[PDB]
Every structure is written in structure tokens, then in C-alpha cells.
Design an enzyme around this catalytic site. Structure first.
Site, PDB file in Angstrom:
ATOM      1  N   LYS A  12      26.663 129.028  53.708  1.00 15.41           N
ATOM      2  CA  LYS A  12      27.104 127.639  53.616  1.00 15.41           C
ATOM      3  C   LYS A  12      28.047 127.430  52.457  1.00 15.41           C
ATOM      4  O   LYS A  12      29.071 126.760  52.597  1.00 15.41           O
ATOM      5  CB  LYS A  12      25.912 126.693  53.451  1.00 15.41           C
ATOM      6  CG  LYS A  12      25.081 126.484  54.699  1.00 15.41           C
ATOM      7  CD  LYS A  12      24.028 125.398  54.496  1.00 15.41           C
ATOM      8  CE  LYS A  12      23.152 125.272  55.735  1.00 15.41           C
ATOM      9  NZ  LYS A  12      22.140 124.188  55.633  1.00 15.41           N
ATOM     10  N   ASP A  67      20.803 118.722  56.398  1.00 18.45           N
ATOM     11  CA  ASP A  67      19.517 118.872  57.043  1.00 18.45           C
ATOM     12  C   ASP A  67      19.852 118.934  58.518  1.00 18.45           C
ATOM     13  O   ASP A  67      20.705 118.176  59.000  1.00 18.45           O
ATOM     14  CB  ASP A  67      18.612 117.679  56.734  1.00 18.45           C
ATOM     15  CG  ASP A  67      17.143 118.030  56.825  1.00 18.45           C
ATOM     16  OD1 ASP A  67      16.796 119.211  56.621  1.00 18.45           O
ATOM     17  OD2 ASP A  67      16.318 117.134  57.094  1.00 18.45           O
ATOM     18  N   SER A  68      19.216 119.860  59.224  1.00 11.96           N
ATOM     19  CA  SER A  68      19.534 120.114  60.618  1.00 11.96           C
ATOM     20  C   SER A  68      18.259 120.307  61.405  1.00 11.96           C
ATOM     21  O   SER A  68      17.170 120.363  60.840  1.00 11.96           O
ATOM     22  CB  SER A  68      20.409 121.356  60.745  1.00 11.96           C
ATOM     23  OG  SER A  68      21.608 121.164  60.029  1.00 11.96           O
ATOM     24  N   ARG A 177      26.961 121.344  63.502  1.00  7.01           N
ATOM     25  CA  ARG A 177      27.434 121.502  62.139  1.00  7.01           C
ATOM     26  C   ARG A 177      28.949 121.295  62.050  1.00  7.01           C
ATOM     27  O   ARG A 177      29.415 120.516  61.206  1.00  7.01           O
ATOM     28  CB  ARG A 177      27.004 122.851  61.541  1.00  7.01           C
ATOM     29  CG  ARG A 177      27.132 122.883  60.011  1.00  7.01           C
ATOM     30  CD  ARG A 177      26.752 124.213  59.372  1.00  7.01           C
ATOM     31  NE  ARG A 177      27.271 124.266  58.008  1.00  7.01           N
ATOM     32  CZ  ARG A 177      26.762 123.583  56.981  1.00  7.01           C
ATOM     33  NH1 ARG A 177      25.708 122.792  57.150  1.00  7.01           N
ATOM     34  NH2 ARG A 177      27.309 123.692  55.779  1.00  7.01           N
TER      35      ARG A 177
END
Lengths: 192, 194
Positions: A12, A67-68, A177
Site C-alpha cells: 500500500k 478499511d475494506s 480499491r
């Protein structure tokens, strides 16, 4: 010049170095090695905001959190904010996958979505939220070998494939995303 | 709080009103009833830029324009930029639908995608473009009667409904145009000094 990522994921962080090439992109562990935020929220959005605000208020810097998760419509949103540890604390994807397939099971309505919420907080700024989504259906069982988490059971109708059957680059085009990041980039572009 | 939209399409203006409830939405037909820009672009983006720049230069205001269409997999992207005038220059939504349906007569892979490109233009900025999309399938007929254009045959699996079956409010939550505008609004929020 500086922007911090409330994450321990070097993937990330490096991703963010390209979208902040004007910036010095710093992983949170460089500033708060013991960073630990109690995710007391109810949605991906609340939990993203807690992470970015905790870092930003303690540091007086601009920070990004996310947050996913997977939401399955027939299971009333499950696994939701419990996506990573759905089937237990040792967070085993296959265990998660098996718990999901078994709770869904016979059910005909297998509609589901991945959601990614990206939060940005800072001193000269109110906290901003960027929500991306991608829709699909829970498959019969596992299909595909790429990716992770629930990718093997997340069928994408518009591509006739599970997320696991897609190349990384193929995933990078249509993912929840990517959708959240597009919204972030548009904001960033906005400030010029 | 005002936004000028350089589109002659009353259906689009309606959608935009849903999507900007805090704005006074002004359709170009109010300011230039005979607005008529030659869409000589070969992409949605080029057509949108031509419309927004033309309105902006003539009015000396910031405006937005919209160029949208339907790309059907089995027809390798038709109708695409020809979406509005697919069946002829009279631009009959009903004729366009009949043609598209006829051309897909037996086809079983009916995957299609709605595409929307919004361009913003003004006297103090370079033109900026934003793209939204939504996936679906072409149904076997017309269902519902809300919306406009190919709405009645664009089935949205997520919702088990065609675009024309959705209330104006629901369409505004998920359309390709909603998605493009989200990128726009984020851009606008970015220019309020982060």
C-alpha cells in the site's frame, strides 16, 4: 511535502508513493511504532476515520487510512468489518471462505460487493472520505489462483471470472480499491 | 450555488438535478435555447470537451458538459459514441432501442456498459474531464418507463432491475453519470484548499 500512511503494508505504501510523487510518503510505523487503534466503529468508514484521525491528531501531519471488506447481501452485510477475521482470530482466508460458503450455501441470491473506504485527515483540513465499490456474486466454491482473501469466491459478471482468475493488473482496473483511489486522486488533482 | 450544464438533453438535466440537490442546476436550454455544437470527436471525452469549451467561451462562465453512451460487448463497443443517433439523425430513443435489440436478436452474451464523461471548462482553468461507468446486460425488451435513452433495456444485475425501472433517486445512486460526478465533486472539494 510529507504524507503518512496508517498502514503496515509495504504494498500500500509503495502504491501511495506514485500518487504522492510530489510528497515524502512515510509509513506510520516510522512515527508511531506501537500504533494501535481500537476499531470501535460500525462501518468501514468509521474505522477508517478512527485510524487516520488518531494518527493525525497525535502527529499534526496529514495521514491516510483505509478499511475494506466483503458484504454479502443475503447475510445482511457479513462479513463486513469482520472480513479479515470472519472465521476466527488467526485470520485464515480459506477458513473465512469456508465459513462464508457454508452460511450462504443453498441460497440463490448470491449478490455481494467489495467496498474500500479511504480516509484522509490532517491539521488544516476536515477529514475526507473516499468510497470505492465493485459488485459481484459469491461463486459455487473456489475458482482461480491469484489475489487473496475472498477473491476465489467473488465472481465478476462483467468479466465472467472470479477476482482470483484475474491478473493483478486486471484486478487493478476494476477493484473497489482502484475506485476509492480514483476519488482520492481527483481530490488531490483538485488542489492545483 | 449554481452549475451550468451544456447539454440539450432534458433527461441528462433531470439526472443532474437529482445528483446536485444543493445546487441551482441550469440547463443550457435556459441560456442558449438553440445551443448546437458539432460533435466531431471520435471519443466521448472529445465530444464533451467540445461542448463545455463552446458554452464556456460564449458565456464567459465555468460550465460542464456530458457525453455518454452504451458499449455492448457482443457488438465490440457499439453503439459507443454513436449511441445518441444510432438509428438515425432524428435521434429517436425508441428507434435506437429497436435497432440495438434487432442487432442482438439471438445473442446470449448480452454484457454491456454505460459510459459517462463529464468535462468542466471555464475562463480560468484548463478543461478537465472525468469518467464514470456502470455495468449491466441488455435485456430482451423494454422494462419500466423512467429515465431516458437506453434506460429501458439496460438491466442492472446488482439491482435485478433495468435503469428505467429505478426511481430517479435510486438511478442517481448508481448510474455512470453519478460515478463521473463523484470524481468531479471530489475534484471540487480538493480545490477548497484540501
Amino acid at each position: 511535502k510529507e504524507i503518512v500512511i496508517a498502514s503496515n503494508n509495504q504494498g500500500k505504501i509503495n502504491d501511495f508513493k506514485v500518487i504522492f510523487p510530489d510528497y515524502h510518503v512515510i509509513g506510520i510505523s516510522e512515527l508511531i511504532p506501537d500504533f494501535d487503534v481500537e476499531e470501535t466503529g460500525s462501518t468501514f468508514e468509521e474505522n477508517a476515520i478512527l485510524k487516520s484521525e488518531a494518527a493525525a491528531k497525535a502527529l499534526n501531519k496529514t495521514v491516510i487510512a483505509d478499511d475494506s471488506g466483503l458484504e454479502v447481501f443475503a447475510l445482511n452485510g457479513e462479513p463486513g468489518i469482520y472480513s479479515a477475521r470472519y472465521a476466527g482470530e488467526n485470520k485464515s482466508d480459506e477458513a473465512n471462505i469456508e465459513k462464508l460458503l457454508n452460511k450462504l450455501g443453498n441460497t440463490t441470491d448470491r449478490r455481494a460487493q467489495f467496498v474500500c473506504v479511504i480516509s484522509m485527515s490532517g491539521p488544516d483540513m476536515e477529514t475526507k472520505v473516499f468510497k470505492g465499490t465493485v459488485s459481484g456474486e459469491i461463486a459455487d466454491g473456489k475458482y482461480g489462483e491469484n489475489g487473496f482473501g475472498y477473491d476465489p469466491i467473488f465472481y465478476v459478471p462483467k468479466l465472467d471470472k472470479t477476482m482470483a482468475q484475474l491478473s493483478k493488473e486486471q484486478k487493478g482496473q476494476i477493484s473497489h480499491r482502484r475506485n476509492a483511489i480514483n476519488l482520492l486522486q481527483a481530490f488531490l488533482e483538485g488542489e492545483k
